[PDB]
Design a protein around this nucleic acid. Structure first.
Lengths: 70, 29
RNA sequence: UCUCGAGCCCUAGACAGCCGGGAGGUGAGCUUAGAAGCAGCUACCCUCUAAGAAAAGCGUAACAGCUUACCGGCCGAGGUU
């Protein structure tokens, strides 16, 4: 239902395309707060019980695109 | 005497407290 | 086909067979009109969990679909190098 993760990130990230090489090329950043919201938009699309785990999933695509956290 | 088989039993005996053979094992304890 | 030896696995169930499960974020990102395990490039992370790859081999125009990994069950004694 709710749109995919990859896109949700590209919104608050402020960018469109990722980097040719993930983690090796940091495209954008994301405050944990921001990530706490994205994890709130996909409450159903995820199996995780706590919001913590929900973030681990979301925070699983970021670093693999150059989406660092602060 | 694999370690994981040993760890499993304990992990199980821990839930009971709060593979079929490992369950029977945990129960026998 | 006979005989002798070494290593490893095994009744906490080995090896094989058969049955059941092989799941979510997510059709990863990039490339591209499109590519969703499986053209190429890079990465290859985490949830649920007893398991389940950012996918090993076919398969597709691309999906679909079919199996491997991996877990569980039935079975029950040697098995494998």
């Amino acid at each position: 239902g709710v749109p995919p993760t990859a896109e949700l990130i590209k919104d608050e990230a402020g960018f469109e395309t990722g980097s040719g090489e993930p983690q090796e090329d940091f495209v954008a950043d994301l405050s944990v707060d921001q990530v706490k919201q994205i994890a709130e938009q996909k409450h159903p699309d995820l199996l995780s019980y706590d919001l913590t785990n929900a973030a681990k999933e979301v925070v699983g695509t970021c670093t693999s695109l150059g989406v660092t956290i602060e | 005497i694999p370690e994981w088989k040993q760890e499993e039993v304990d992990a199980i005996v821990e839930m009971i407290e709060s593979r079929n053979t490992l369950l029977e094992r945990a129960l026998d304890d």
